[PDB]
Amino acid sequence: STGSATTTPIDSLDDAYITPVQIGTPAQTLNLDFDTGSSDLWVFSSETTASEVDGQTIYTPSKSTTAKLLSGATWSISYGDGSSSSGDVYTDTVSVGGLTVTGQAVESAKKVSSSFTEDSTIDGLLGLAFSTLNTVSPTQQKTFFDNAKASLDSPVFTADLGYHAPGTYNFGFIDTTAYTGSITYTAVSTKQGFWEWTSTGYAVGSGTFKSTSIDGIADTGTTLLYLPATVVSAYWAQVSGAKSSSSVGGYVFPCSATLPSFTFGVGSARIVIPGDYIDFGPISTGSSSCFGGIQSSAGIGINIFGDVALKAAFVVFNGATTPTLGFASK
């Protein structure tokens, strides 16, 4: 089997991407944030505290003839950005882009933190990191990909995120028309439950490539590119008037600037992030200070190849017995 779904930016900045997901029978379609940095499929629901719901579409298990309470199971998750959610668990039929899993754990939120409530466009998350991170207790649950894997034509999914445009998540096949050149594969460590890999270095603009190992995670659920402070300082030093602002919480730059590109290494290959991808716009409405898309990972404890990086590539998440990542230009 295969699945193919379009993923759409939630706003003009590509702050996140939503992908429609069919849950239950008859189908309830929710727009989920596919997150290769976590491993819980959780939704706004009929159980979510009413004051914590503001415009999201909810999953109502009592209206699904295939929903079953997973008795005793609870979940609770906290994300890198400080957001959180928790609740109880159903199993139900879940389909993405024509690919169907029966018996998927659908984590129904009883509580969500303010950032989720405030984002009317995201009805929940669909985690695509390794199932060892799933928070369900006392019986950990599998991701949608891990449940689909054995049925897929190839044990892979691909992320093809757009810049200010829709893109695609494919399950079970490589679309050879979706990228240029060849896919370069690179080793993955699953020891922290992430799609963790080692970039071979970087360049800033037309600058020389610096060969250096940068361990980090391929995380579709993180907006920005978070890299070591040395790398980030080297990038923003090339932008007149850029500075790290403790008050704003990262590097800002004059909105009048033209940003340089950023290149990262994948083995001997190179992925080029155009400068425009690194512009996250005014820090507040009407400000001439703009927020940078490349930020320090110092204090986060891991480097994160978030959407700013991934949307410059066609990315293969190879879930073979020994997982690997692939990157192609596009």
Ligand code: NA
């Ligand atoms: Na922000």
